[PDB]
Amino acid sequence: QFEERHLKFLQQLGKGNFGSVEMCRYDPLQDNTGEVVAVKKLQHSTEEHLRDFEREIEILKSLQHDNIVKYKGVCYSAGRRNLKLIMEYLPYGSLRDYLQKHKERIDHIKLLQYTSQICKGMEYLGTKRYIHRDLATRNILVENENRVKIGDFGLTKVLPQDKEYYKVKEPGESPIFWYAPESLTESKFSVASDVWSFGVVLYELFTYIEKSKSPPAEFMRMIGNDKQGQMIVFHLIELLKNNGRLPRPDGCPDEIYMIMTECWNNNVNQRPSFRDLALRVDQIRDNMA
Numbered sequence: 001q002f003e004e005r006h007l008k009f010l011q012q013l014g015k016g017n018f019g020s021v022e023m024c025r026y027d028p029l030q031d032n033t034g035e036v037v038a039v040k041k042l043q044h045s046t047e048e049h050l051r052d053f054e055r056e057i058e059i060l061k062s063l064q065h066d067n068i069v070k071y072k073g074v075c076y077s078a079g080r081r082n083l084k085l086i087m088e089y090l091p092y093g094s095l096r097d098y099l100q101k102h103k104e105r106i107d108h109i110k111l112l113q114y115t116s117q118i119c120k121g122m123e124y125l126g127t128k129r130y131i132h133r134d135l136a137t138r139n140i141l142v143e144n145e146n147r148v149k150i151g152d153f154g155l156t157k158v159l160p161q162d163k164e165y166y167k168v169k170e171p172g173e174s175p176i177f178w179y180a181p182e183s184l185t186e187s188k189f190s191v192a193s194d195v196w197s198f199g200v201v202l203y204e205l206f207t208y209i210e211k212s213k214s215p216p217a218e219f220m221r222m223i224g225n226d227k228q229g230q231m232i233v234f235h236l237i238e239l240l241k242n243n244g245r246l247p248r249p250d251g252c253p254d255e256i257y258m259i260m261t262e263c264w265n266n267n268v269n270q271r272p273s274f275r276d277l278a279l280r281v282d283q284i285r286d287n288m289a
């Protein structure tokens with residue numbers, strides 16, 4: 001539904017290997033009245049990455065929720081080459097950058113509002129049997145000061161109809177410091193591993209994205225900054241197997257840290273549900289108010 005000739009590039013909003021997102025104006029009348037949109041494209045579009053991208057687009061189109069970024073459409077040139085995903089543009093960028101840049105004005109009650117919205121989005125995913133696999137504040141977007149949305153679904157998988165986990169090992173770097181132990185050891189991803197990652201997101205929020213307090217920084221100190229290459233993963237596994245954990249962030253109340261530590265249960269089946277997480281967070285919010 002979008003013609004590429006009418007997409008006007010404004011700036012880059014994000015870039016990894018395999019993908020990037022741009023701020024563009026969609027201006028079919030060419031009179032500078034069109035709306036600004038976000039445009040995701042692949043960076044090294046192998047056929048495998050293209051099939052994954054088409055599945056990612058279908059997943060996002062199937063999702064309709066206040067805390068999930070809105071699908072708008074697709075754009076392609078020359079037959080169907082250089083597929084692009086069109087999404088609503090959210091003006092405050094990623095929650096990671098937003099929180100870092102406005103930490104002095106964002107209090108704990110606001111952090112818990114964001115936490116509750118992220119839980120509701122994840123519960124919605126879970127009802128569709130979708131496993132996100134990449135939950136992190138860098139993949140959460142800020143629509144306004146009172147509303148956040150899960151913003152990227154590049155790694156999201158649909159569970160088989162007969163199993164409660166999905167096994168996958170992607171070649172390349174993996175956000176291992178957000179991964180549940182069974183995801184590190186067995187490449188097993190589930191609603192429960194998303195819950196483990198959600199605990200890491202909650203940690204991130206209460207660190208306010210302070211430099212040396214990031215999960216990678218804290219875990220690398222705990223295993224020794226000398227560890228190199230593959231040993232990193234091995235040592236992380238051993239650390240988590242012995243119940244090594246990220247510390248309580250400065251100023252974090254004990255009850256919030258306790259939500260984190262319960263998400264970080266080595267026993268997959270004893271981690272809370274996203275509905276229970278939302279319930280506990282919302283009760284704490286109400287107590288604070």
Ligand SMILES: CCS(=O)(=O)N1CC(CC#N)(n2cc(-c3ncnc4[nH]ccc34)cn2)C1
Nearest residue numbers: 014015016019020021038089090139151152
């Ligand atoms: C895999 C690296 S990436 O470039 O594809 N990636 C997605 C990313 C993280 C998230 N979410 N990103 C999205 C935006 C963004 N900003 C403003 N409005 C928006 N609408 C839809 C996306 C969006 C900014 N960064 C950075």
